[PDB]
Amino acid sequence: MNRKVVDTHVHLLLSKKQRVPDWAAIKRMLDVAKVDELDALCVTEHIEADGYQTLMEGLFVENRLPGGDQHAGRLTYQGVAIFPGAELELANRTNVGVHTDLEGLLALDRAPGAYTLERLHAVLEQRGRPFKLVAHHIFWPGKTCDDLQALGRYVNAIEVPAKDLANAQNYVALAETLALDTTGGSDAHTFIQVGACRTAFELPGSVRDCTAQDWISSRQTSHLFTAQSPRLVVMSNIYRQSLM
């Protein structure tokens, strides 16, 4: 088998109240992704973010990322691919990672809680375009699910979140119960946390760069962390506290 590693949950905006992408801060995050030997990053920015539209067009449309490289509609930074995505807050207040082509992502309702899981799935199924849905940090307080039965119908993977690794067993056990794949995502909002949990998957055929579509279509995915992962999350928290 051949193997890619991707942080499937990354925020390139520090907060949803940020108007303009801070390119210097983004660069810090990609530098760390390079050091930490990630193959790719999924930008699951909060769709309701003030700066979501500017961020997404800036990255993938207006090619405005300093140091960014765009070949055949694929955005790399020093070899590290950058895949478009969105994090949505659903009607029951859970979070889902949405991985699809940029056209779809820009066409979704952006109001917090605008979709149920059922409707999100229907609307994406309605398009004739590949997509992947990931249940984010499903045991996190304020983000728990009242219907884990329906989750299994509509979602493709359970995320093992970097920020909740002390409880990783629960996420793995839930994925097993539902016969779903797992992902690892960091939910990094700063350079410090990127890659703290990551996703491994096999790409069929010859060694090549992973595309967004290759990730979307991948199955049998799993998560990866280290004993030093929790520390990344704590240091990222201290850093955010210092900025206030």
The span of 85-93, 139-147, 209-217, 225-233 binding Fe ion (CB under 5 A) equals 85-93
Q: Which of 195, 188, 213 is nearest to 80 (CA)?
A: 195
Q: 7, 39, 45, 87: which one contacts Fe ion (CB under 5 A)? A: 87
Residue 39 annotated as part of some ligand binding site: no
CB distance 222 to 180 below 8 Å: no
Site string for Fe ion, 159-198 (x = CB under 5 A): ----------------------------x-----------
Number of residues that bind Fe ion (CB under 5 A): 2
Residue 87 annotated as part of some ligand binding site: yes
Q: Which of 214, 193, 164 is nearest to 10 (CA)?
A: 193
Q: Which is nearer to Fe ion, 39 or 87 (CB)?
A: 87
Q: How many residues does the chain have?
A: 244
Does residue number 7 form part of the binding site for Fe ion (CB under 5 A)?
no
| C-alpha–C-alpha distance, residues 221 and 10, integer Å | 18
Q: Where do runs of H (alpha helix) occur along 127-228? A: 148-154, 168-177, 212-217
160 forms bridges with which residues in the sheet?
184
Q: Which is nearer to Fe ion, 7 or 187 (CB)?
A: 187
Q: Which residues are annotated as a binding site for Fe(2+)?
A: 9, 11, 46, 87, 187, 189
Q: Which residues bind Fe ion (CB under 5 A)?
A: 87, 187
